[PDB]
Amino acid sequence: NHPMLMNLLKD
């Protein structure tokens, strides 16, 4: 459930 942190982490 961390869509924004996930997005900033993506390659």
Add this chain to the structure above:
Amino acid sequence: RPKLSEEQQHIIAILLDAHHKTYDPTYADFRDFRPPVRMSPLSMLPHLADLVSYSIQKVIGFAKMIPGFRDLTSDDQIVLLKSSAIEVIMLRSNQSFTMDDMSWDCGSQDYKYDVTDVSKAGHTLELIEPLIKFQVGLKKLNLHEEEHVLLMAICIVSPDRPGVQDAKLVEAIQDRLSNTLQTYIRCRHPPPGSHQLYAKMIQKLADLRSLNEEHSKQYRSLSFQPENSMKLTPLVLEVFGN
């Protein structure tokens, strides 16, 4: 015999550049945040929420560039960032902190923050006193930029954060960074400044665990009144809690 390998100079070059790409010492983006008000119950909350939100983004940008960080699972990346964010923010803020008046001097009076600013974001001296103490003891280490960027990276890749899966993987990445730091001080940090420098740096990480705890406490109390929670950002709510 203390030898800085090829790999170790590479790590330092990468972390320096990573830091350079994620810390703007001109503080130009501050003009995008909701404006500071020093008139005032939690008058600094909107501005400081924005500053912290922005800081979270830069920390994440720095973390992705840590050698080995990429090799972790998305889930562990997430756990390391959520638990370390406020700590790395406190660490990275040391760069603008000044012992003249014990404030953070981000270019201008509008963006010069002291204890009453931080109070006006909803924090008490239970946090702020040990915060200022930390900043002072950290500033007095007079770290090389090299040691500073390694310290941030070591903070992020911490195996004991609650929720880690592959602790052993996190431990090996952090060791590579620890060893680079220990070796760096040995080879490039002259005495007396070098005396116990590593142990004092690790002590600062211990200090940060305690600051992290108190920040969490006061944030949960802050963010319980939905009127305060309203004034935060979506990234702050996601990362610090809701």
